[PDB]
Amino acid sequence: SKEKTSALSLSNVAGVFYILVGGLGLAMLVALIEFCYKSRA
Amino acid sequence: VLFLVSRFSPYSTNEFGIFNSLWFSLGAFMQQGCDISPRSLSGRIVGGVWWFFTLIIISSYTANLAAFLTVERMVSPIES
Amino acid sequence: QGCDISPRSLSGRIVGGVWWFFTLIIISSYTANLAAFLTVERMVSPIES
Amino acid sequence: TIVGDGKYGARDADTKIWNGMVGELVYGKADIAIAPLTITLVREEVIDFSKPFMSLGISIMIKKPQKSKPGVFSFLDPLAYEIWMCIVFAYIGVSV
Amino acid sequence: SRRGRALLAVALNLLALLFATTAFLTTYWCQGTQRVPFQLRRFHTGIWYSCEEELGGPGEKCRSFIDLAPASEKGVLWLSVVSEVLYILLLVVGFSLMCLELLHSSSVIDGLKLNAFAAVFTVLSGLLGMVAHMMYTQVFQVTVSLGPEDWRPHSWDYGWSFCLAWGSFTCCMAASVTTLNSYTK
Amino acid sequence: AEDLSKQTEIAYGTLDSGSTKEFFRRSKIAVFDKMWTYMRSAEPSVFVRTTAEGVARVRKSKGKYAYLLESTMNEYIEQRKPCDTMKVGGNLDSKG
Amino acid sequence: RTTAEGVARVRKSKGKYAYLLESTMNEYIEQRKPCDTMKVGGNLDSKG
Numbered sequence: 001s002k003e004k005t006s007a008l009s010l011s012n013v014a015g016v017f018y019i020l021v022g023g024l025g026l027a028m029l030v031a032l033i034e035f036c037y038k039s040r041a
Numbered sequence: 042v043l044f045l046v047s048r049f050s051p052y053s054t055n056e057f058g059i060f061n062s063l064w065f066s067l068g069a070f071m072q073q074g075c076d077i078s079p080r081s082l083s084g085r086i087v088g089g090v091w092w093f094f095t096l097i098i099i100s101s102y103t104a105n106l107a108a109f110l111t112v113e114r115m116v117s118p119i120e121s
Numbered sequence: 122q123g124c125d126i127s128p129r130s131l132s133g134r135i136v137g138g139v140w141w142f143f144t145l146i147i148i149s150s151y152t153a154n155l156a157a158f159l160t161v162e163r164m165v166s167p168i169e170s
Numbered sequence: 171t172i173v174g175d176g177k178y179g180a181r182d183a184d185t186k187i188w189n190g191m192v193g194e195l196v197y198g199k200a201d202i203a204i205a206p207l208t209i210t211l212v213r214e215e216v217i218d219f220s221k222p223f224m225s226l227g228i229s230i231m232i233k234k235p236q237k238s239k240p241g242v243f244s245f246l247d248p249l250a251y252e253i254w255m256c257i258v259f260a261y262i263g264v265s266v
Numbered sequence: 267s268r269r270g271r272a273l274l275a276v277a278l279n280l281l282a283l284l285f286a287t288t289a290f291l292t293t294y295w296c297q298g299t300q301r302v303p304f305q306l307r308r309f310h311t312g313i314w315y316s317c318e319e320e321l322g323g324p325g326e327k328c329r330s331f332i333d334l335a336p337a338s339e340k341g342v343l344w345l346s347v348v349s350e351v352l353y354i355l356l357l358v359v360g361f362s363l364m365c366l367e368l369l370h371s372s373s374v375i376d377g378l379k380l381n382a383f384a385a386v387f388t389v390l391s392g393l394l395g396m397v398a399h400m401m402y403t404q405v406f407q408v409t410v411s412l413g414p415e416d417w418r419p420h421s422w423d424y425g426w427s428f429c430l431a432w433g434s435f436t437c438c439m440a441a442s443v444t445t446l447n448s449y450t451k
Numbered sequence: 452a453e454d455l456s457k458q459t460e461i462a463y464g465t466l467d468s469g470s471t472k473e474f475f476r477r478s479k480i481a482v483f484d485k486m487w488t489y490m491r492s493a494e495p496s497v498f499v500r501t502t503a504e505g506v507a508r509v510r511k512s513k514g515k516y517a518y519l520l521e522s523t524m525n526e527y528i529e530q531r532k533p534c535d536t537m538k539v540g541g542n543l544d545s546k547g
Numbered sequence: 548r549t550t551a552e553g554v555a556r557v558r559k560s561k562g563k564y565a566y567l568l569e570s571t572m573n574e575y576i577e578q579r580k581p582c583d584t585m586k587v588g589g590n591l592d593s594k595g
């Protein structure tokens with residue numbers, strides 16, 4: 001019967017920030033390799 | 042990151058300035074949207090990942106704000 | 122439903138900024154509290170004294 | 171009286187010696203044991219038992235599982251893995 | 267003008283070096299207090315050494331933070347410190363090429379792409395930087411919840427030098443957009 | 452007891468002198484004989500000499516030890532302060 | 548009246564009617580079609 005009013009901690013949505021930054025560096029990877037190919041062609 | 046992506050890639054004219062990129066990311070986060078559209082593929086990635094960020098957080102916010110006011114009606118204010 | 126026009130002024134985008142965060146609270150406040158009535162119901166007594 | 175050694179009762183298979191509450195009644199030191207003692211066959215042969223005043227079973231006691239730290243990918247807990255796959259499969263097709 | 271924008275961009279990077287390395291060396295990230303049954307002990311920790319005040323004097327008994335945790339969370343914590351050390355050193359790669367940005371420095375010609383790769387690195391610094399601040403606060407929170415007994419902190423409150431750690435990641439970006447502004451103009 | 456026989460992530464034992472340990476040694480059920488073999492095979496100290504010692508062994512293990520004991524032994528620990536442990540599954544066997 | 552009638556009420560009452568009975572009769576009914584009755588809990592008693 002003793003249930004609590006608990007806010008979400010950062011651990012609950014923790015991986016969403018991880019796949020945010022992983023999605024950021026992937027776009028950093030693509031923004032490099034799209035300018036390099038047009039500079040070759 | 043989105044401001045850095047628009048300048049580096051060739052994809053002209055660039056509607057993603059440091060005043061504009063802070064505006065496009067806000068409308069995505071408040072789920073309203075904005076007028077400009079990222080056109081480079083690396084620009085569409087940085088839009089799409091921020092999109093999946095704001096759909097988890099707000100839905101976590103709305104579920105947890107339902108989670109308080111569900112408990113607040115099951116208090117059983119002891120009567121006898 | 123974010124409309125097609127978009128503000129092009131800094132003091133305007135402060136207005137367009139703070140009005141957005143007003144809505145994301147209230148509508149999520151509305152969905153939250155309407156979950157409270159359908160899940161946990163209190164049939165209130167019409168008289169109490 | 172407390173059992174002097176403190177054990178419920180056992181025999182070493184090597185030395186064939188009962189110790190604990192069992193070894194006290196077999197050797198004649200104690201007179202009776204009204205205690206949590208199981209009626210087993212190796213106890214039935216050495217001492218006599220009445221009908222059970224209580225019946226039981228062997229359970230397993232663990233620490234009550236508190237909520238863990240949620241995982242890295244614990245955000246996608248409310249939907250099945252099969253759903254997210256079928257979304258992305260359908261996300262391709264509606265685009266095509 | 268265009269030399270004036272490069273001057274602030276390096277000086278904000280030097281703030282980001284000073285604010286991060288302060289955080290990495292100071293053991294005052296988490297201002298907490300612990301008690302023995304009515305005596306209370308203030309303490310403070312970081313990633314390396316948890317230094318606890320003792321009564322009867324100054325105290326400052328310093329205990330290692332890495333082995334303090336349980337094992338799987340420690341395994342995350344092995345990756346967090348490496349993520350922060352790589353943030354500091356790739357900040358050092360950042361402003362050093364911003365020292366080549368200067369007009370009295372190496373060259374004007376092919377100086378634009380020198381300004382290009384460095385600001386890439388400052389983004390790649392703070393992205394690994396913010397995650398390093400993420401992985402500590404998650405793991406430290408577990409140690410507050412599940413850690414070895416005779417010490418349980420009442421308040422997990424984040425103190426000074428860790429707000430400065432957020433100010434470091436803050437000033438990583440304002441310096442990086444201005445050299446992006448210097449790249450486009 | 453099946454899943455404890457499928458996985459040794461959490462160690463499990465009994466009391467070092469008692470009919471319950473004696474029951475597992477004389478067991479011919481394919482599960483329980485496997486359960487008896489692991490108790491003696493790898494030993495940092497598996498068995499305990501006291502029930503309350505094993506109760507202290509479980510609660511301070513952070514879920515890494517499970518103490519096998521009797522049913523009416525186990526309901527009294529669950530309705531005691533601090534009510535930190537619980538029964539899992541059900542009774543393994545009939546005893547008296 | 549008999550066990551075969553009492554277990555049949557469980558098939559028709561849609562989970563509103565529990566029929567207490569012995570364990571070894573409870574296991575054999577579980578292993579026969581429609582396999583739509585489930586033992587819950589452990590033994591309340593021990594008999595022979």
Ligand SMILES: N[C@@H](Cn1oc(=O)[nH]c1=O)C(=O)O
Nearest residue numbers: 178207208466469470471502
């Ligand atoms: N009491 C039982 C044996 N036993 O009791 C425990 O608490 N553990 C255990 O193995 C007996 O031998 O009769």
